[PDB]
C-alpha cells in the first residue's frame, strides 16, 4: 500500500504555493513600510489577517497528508 | 482502494494557487494603504469580497478531496 | 539502476526555485544599487543573508538526492 | 525500499516553492533600504518574521520527506 506514502507527498507539494504567497505579502509589507513608516501598526495588523488564512491553508496541506498516510 | 488517496491528494494539490492569490490581494491592499491611508476603510471591504470567492474555491479544493477519498 | 535513481533525479527539481530566488535577490540588489550607489556595501550585506538560506536549501536537495541514490 | 524514496524526493519540491518567496522577501528588503536607508531596522525585523515562517515550512517539507523515507 505504498501509494499512501505517495499521496502524502503529492499533498505536501502544495506548500510551495503558500510560501510564495507569504513571501510576496511580507515583501509588500516591507516596501509599504519604506514609504509611510508612521502607520506600520496598521500594515502589520492587516498583514496578520492575510497570514491568519494562509497558515490555515498550509495546515490543511499538512493535516490531510497524515490522513492520506494512515486513513 | 489505495488510489482514492492519490486522487484526494491531487485535488488538494491546487490550494497553492489560492494562497498565491490571497498573497497578491493582501500585498496590493498593504501597498494601496501605504500610498493612501485615509481610504483603508474601503481597501479592506473589496479585499474581503475577493476572498469571498477564493475561500469558496478553496473549500471546493478541500471538500471534493474528501469525496474523492471515500467515493 | 532502479527507482532510487528516479528519486535522486526528482530531488533535483527544486534547484529551479532556488535559482529563481537567487536571481530575484541579485536583481533587486542591482536595482537598489543603480538607485542608490552610496550604500552598495550595505545592500550586499543583507543580500548575503538571503543566500545563507537559499544556498543552504539548495544544497540540502543535492545532499538528500545522494541520500536517495545511495539509500 | 522502492516507493519511499519516490515519496521523499516528491516532498522535496516544496523547497523550490519556498526559495521563491524568500528571494522576493529579501529583494523587497533590499529595495526598501534603497528607497529609505534611514530605516534598515524596522524592516529587518518584519523580514525576519516572514523568513521564520518560511523556514518553518521548509522544515516541514524536509522532515516529512525523511519520515516517509523511514516509514
Amino acid at each position: 500500500a505504498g501509494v499512501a506514502s505517495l499521496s502524502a507527498a503529492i499533498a505536501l507539494m502544495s506548500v510551495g504555493g503558500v510560501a510564495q504567497g507569504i513571501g510576496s505579502l511580507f515583501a509588500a509589507l516591507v516596501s509599504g513600510t519604506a514609504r509611510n513608516p508612521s502607520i506600520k501598526e496598521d500594515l502589520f495588523t492587516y498583514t496578520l489577517i492575510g497570514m491568519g488564512f494562509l497558515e490555515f491553508l498550509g495546515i490543511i496541506c499538512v493535516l490531510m497528508s497524515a490522513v492520506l498516510l494512515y486513513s | 482502494a489505495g488510489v482514492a488517496s492519490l486522487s484526494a491528494a491531487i485535488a488538494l494539490m491546487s490550494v497553492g494557487g489560492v494562497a498565491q492569490g490571497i498573497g497578491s490581494l493582501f500585498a496590493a491592499l498593504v501597498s494601496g494603504t501605504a500610498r493612501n491611508p485615509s481610504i483603508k476603510e474601503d481597501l479592506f471591504t473589496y479585499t474581503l469580497i475577493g476572498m469571498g470567492f477564493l475561500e469558496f474555491l478553496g473549500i471546493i479544493c478541500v471538500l471534493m478531496s474528501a469525496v474523492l477519498l471515500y467515493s | 539502476a532502479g527507482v532510487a535513481s528516479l528519486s535522486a533525479a526528482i530531488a533535483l527539481m527544486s534547484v529551479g526555485g532556488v535559482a529563481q530566488g537567487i536571481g530575484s535577490l541579485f536583481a533587486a540588489l542591482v536595482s537598489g544599487t543603480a538607485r542608490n550607489p552610496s550604500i552598495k556595501e550595505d545592500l550586499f550585506t543583507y543580500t548575503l543573508i538571503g543566500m545563507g538560506f537559499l544556498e543552504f536549501l539548495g544544497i540540502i536537495c543535492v545532499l538528500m538526492s545522494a541520500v536517495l541514490l545511495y539509500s | 525500499a522502492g516507493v519511499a524514496s519516490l515519496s521523499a524526493a516528491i516532498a522535496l519540491m516544496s523547497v523550490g516553492g519556498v526559495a521563491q518567496g524568500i528571494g522576493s522577501l529579501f529583494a523587497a528588503l533590499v529595495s526598501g533600504t534603497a528607497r529609505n536607508p534611514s530605516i534598515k531596522e524596522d524592516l529587518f525585523t518584519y523580514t525576519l518574521i516572514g523568513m521564520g515562517f518560511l523556514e518553518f515550512l521548509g522544515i516541514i517539507c524536509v522532515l516529512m520527506s525523511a519520515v516517509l523515507l523511514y516509514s
Partner: peptide
C-alpha cells in the same frame, strides 16, 4: 509490467 519499477506500485 514492462515498467516494473513504476507500474507495479499502483494499477498493477
Amino acid at each position: 509490467y514492462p515498467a516494473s519499477p513504476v507500474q507495479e506500485i499502483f494499477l498493477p
